[PDB]
Amino acid sequence: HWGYGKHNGPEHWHKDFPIAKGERQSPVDIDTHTAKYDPSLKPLSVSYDQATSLRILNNGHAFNVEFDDSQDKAVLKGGPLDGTYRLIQFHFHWGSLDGQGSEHTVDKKKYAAELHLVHWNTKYGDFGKAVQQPDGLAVLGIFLKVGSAKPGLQKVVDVLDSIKTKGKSADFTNFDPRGLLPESLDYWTYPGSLTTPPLLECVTWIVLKEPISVSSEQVLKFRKLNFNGEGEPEELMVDNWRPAQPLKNRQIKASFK
Numbered sequence: 001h002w003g004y005g006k007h008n009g010p011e012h013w014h015k016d017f018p019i020a021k022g023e024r025q026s027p028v029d030i031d032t033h034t035a036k037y038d039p040s041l042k043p044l045s046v047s048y049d050q051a052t053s054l055r056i057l058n059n060g061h062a063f064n065v066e067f068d069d070s071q072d073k074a075v076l077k078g079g080p081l082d083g084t085y086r087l088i089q090f091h092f093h094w095g096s097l098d099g100q101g102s103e104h105t106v107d108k109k110k111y112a113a114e115l116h117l118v119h120w121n122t123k124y125g126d127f128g129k130a131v132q133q134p135d136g137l138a139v140l141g142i143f144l145k146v147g148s149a150k151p152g153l154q155k156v157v158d159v160l161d162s163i164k165t166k167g168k169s170a171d172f173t174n175f176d177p178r179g180l181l182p183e184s185l186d187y188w189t190y191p192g193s194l195t196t197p198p199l200l201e202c203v204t205w206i207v208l209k210e211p212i213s214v215s216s217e218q219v220l221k222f223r224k225l226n227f228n229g230e231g232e233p234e235e236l237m238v239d240n241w242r243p244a245q246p247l248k249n250r251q252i253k254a255s256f257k
């Protein structure tokens with residue numbers, strides 16, 4: 001099956017998922033000098049006060065923190081979006097070394113990790129319907145750079161020992177995702193895709209300009225997770241990122257100048 005190894009990684013995915021060579025694939029390199037400032041873009045509205053986290057899961061390719069999305073509890077509105085998008089989960093992509101790990105790049109610069117806060121358009125009723133629509137998902141992407149520790153991330157870091165292998169989950173209640181946001185909500189936006197199979201072209205990407213800083217010790221703990229299940233030979237969960245894809249006939253817009 002697909003993964004991030006030499007024999008099943010991103011350069012192989014097109015054989016099972018031909019959309020991998022499609023017209024709206026993610027991630028992309030953000031060329032800051034060719035992005036277009038769009039004064040019609042609205043500020044983002046992030047309403048995470050009533051977020052209800054439920055569980056953290058190692059799914060074999062990343063770890064997901066899952067939220068209750070049965071009501072409009074934690075929503076994203078505004079920006080380039082029409083309507084209301086509910087938060088369903090967040091996860092990260094990261095590297096084996098501090099100089100790689102992000103999926104998006106900025107003027108070819110790679111960050112140590114990238115956080116994806118995943119939201120779905122409530123007009124489609126459920127997440128599975130939303131992924132079939134061109135405006136179904138909105139993903140907030142936040143870059144991580146290695147520096148000072150991020151206090152709001154430590155609760156995530158400390159539970160990773162309990163979900164070391166694929167298929168393990170743990171209860172993870174009362175986590176506030178507001179502690180993961182940067183000070184500024186300036187962003188770039190473009191239409192794209194999931195970055196993992198099935199690579200569906202259903203995502204409005206909103207990539208924040210300002211990275212958050214995490215400490216070396218925090219990111220080191222991400223690198224101790226395993227791709228494998230318990231009892232199988234150990235494969236460290238590192239470099240779970242897809243390289244940049246061609247922009248094709250797309251324009252990246254900026255909310256700032």
Ligand SMILES: O=C(CCCCCCC(=O)Nc1ccccc1)NO
Binds near residue numbers: 118131193194197
């Ligand atoms: O692709 C991304 C960003 C958005 C991920 C959305 C969650 C992944 C997911 O649920 N994938 C999926 C969708 C439909 C059918 C099967 C899997 N990062 O890797």
Ligand SMILES: [Zn+2]
Binds near residue numbers: 091092093116195
């Ligand atoms: Zn992702």
